[PDB]
């Protein structure tokens, strides 16, 4: 693997390639708000891909979009064939953004493009970044939902809600974003995997510990609850 590092936003280039970038990482920070009629739900990109700074997507197991570039087209078994960066964004879009697809050429997609090609810069086309994807945790043993309701109400509620449909901040964003019911994600989503789910938990919540265990009964309570069908 390579590092994870971050481009400086001072050095962004004037032109219209600095613009794009800038525009890209505000439709993956406000997703919703920015392309409504292809989100279907509350989740922004960095709800599931946070990064420091305002930026989007630098975070070690949280699925940094840094060095994404470089490794597409790749295979997708989802798809049966290689695929491209291009679509597998359309398939975040229909997953966890339980939306649709942008064409392939839509202006917004090339943004969002640009702006991961710059988190990319410097990083060699076919390098792995180290703390790419969300590592997946696995137990060796059933996830203990009675337990992970316990802990739920004890680590996670506070901010996601007892109801699982999050904190919407004073301009209509998520704060703290849902975790089931029809403003999540869908089915089909990654985050809909208990294993993905137990690991980006592990890694990241809560916000700001867990041992594995804790993280793999708390994921198994939080799906256990309906989202819309993929
Ligand atoms: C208690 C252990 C939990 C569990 C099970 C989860 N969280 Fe959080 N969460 C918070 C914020 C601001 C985000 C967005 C991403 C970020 O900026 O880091 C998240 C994200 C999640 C996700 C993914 C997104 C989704 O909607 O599914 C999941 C699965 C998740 N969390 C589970 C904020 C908080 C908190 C506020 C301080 C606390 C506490 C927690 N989260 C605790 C948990
Ligand atoms: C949680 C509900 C998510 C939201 C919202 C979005 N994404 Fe996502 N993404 C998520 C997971 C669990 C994964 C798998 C990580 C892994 O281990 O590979 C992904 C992966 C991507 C990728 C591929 C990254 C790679 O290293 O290959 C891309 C390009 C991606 N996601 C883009 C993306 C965009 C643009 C989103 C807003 C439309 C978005 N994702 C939301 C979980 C979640
Ligand atoms: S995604």
Same mark, same amino acid.
């Given at each position: 693997?390579?590092?994870?590092? !971050?481009?400086? +936003?001072?050095? *962004?280039?004037?032109?219209?390639?600095?613009?794009?970038?800038?525009?890209?990482?505000?439709?993956?920070?406000?997703?919703?708000?920015?392309?409504?009629?292809?989100?279907?739900?509350?989740? /922004? %990109?960095?709800? %599931?891909? @946070?990064?420091?700074?305002?930026?989007?997507?630098?975070?070690?197991?949280? +699925? @940094?979009?840094? &060095? !994404?570039?470089?490794?597409?087209?790749?295979?997708? /078994?989802?798809?049966?064939?290689?695929?491209?960066?291009?679509?597998?964004?359309?398939?975040?879009?229909?997953?966890?953004?339980?939306?649709?697809?942008?064409?392939?050429?839509? @202006? +917004? *997609?090339?943004?969002?493009?640009?702006?991961?090609?710059? *988190?990319?810069? =410097?990083?060699?086309? =076919?390098?792995? !970044?180290?703390?790419?994807?969300?590592?997946? *945790?696995?137990?060796?043993?059933?996830?203990?939902?009675?337990? &992970?309701? /316990?802990?739920?109400?004890?680590? %996670?509620? #506070?901010?996601?809600?007892?109801?699982?449909? &999050?904190?919407?901040? #004073?301009?209509?964003?998520?704060?703290? @974003?849902?975790?089931?019911?029809?403003?999540?994600?869908?089915? &089909?989503? =990654?985050?809909?995997?208990? +294993?993905?789910? /137990?690991?980006?938990?592990?890694?990241?919540?809560?916000?700001?510990?867990?041992?594995?265990?804790?993280?793999?009964?708390?994921? =198994?309570?939080?799906?256990?609850?309906?989202?819309?069908?993929?």
């Amino acid at each position: 693997t390579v590092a994870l590092t !971050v481009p400086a +936003a001072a050095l *962004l280039p004037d032109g219209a390639l600095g613009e794009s970038i800038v525009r890209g990482r505000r439709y993956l920070s406000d997703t919703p708000a920015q392309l409504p009629d292809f989100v279907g739900n509350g989740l /922004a %990109c960095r709800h %599931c891909h @946070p990064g420091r700074d305002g930026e989007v997507g630098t975070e070690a197991n949280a +699925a @940094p979009f840094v &060095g !994404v570039v470089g490794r597409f087209p790749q295979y997708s /078994a989802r798809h049966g064939r290689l695929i491209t960066l291009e679509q597998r964004i359309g398939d975040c879009f229909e997953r966890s953004l339980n939306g649709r697809a942008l064409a392939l050429d839509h @202006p +917004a *997609l090339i943004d969002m493009l640009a702006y991961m090609s710059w *988190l990319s810069q =410097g990083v060699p086309v =076919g390098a792995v !970044v180290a703390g790419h994807g969300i590592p997946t *945790l696995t137990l060796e043993r059933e996830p203990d939902g009675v337990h &992970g309701e /316990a802990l739920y109400q004890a680590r %996670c509620l #506070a901010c996601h809600g007892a109801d699982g449909s &999050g904190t919407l901040d #004073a301009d209509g964003r998520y704060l703290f @974003p849902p975790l089931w019911g029809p403003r999540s994600f869908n089915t &089909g989503a =990654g985050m809909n995997r208990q +294993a993905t789910a /137990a690991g980006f938990i592990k890694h990241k919540m809560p916000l700001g510990s867990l041992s594995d265990e804790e993280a793999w009964d708390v994921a =198994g309570f939080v799906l256990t609850h309906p989202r819309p069908l993929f």
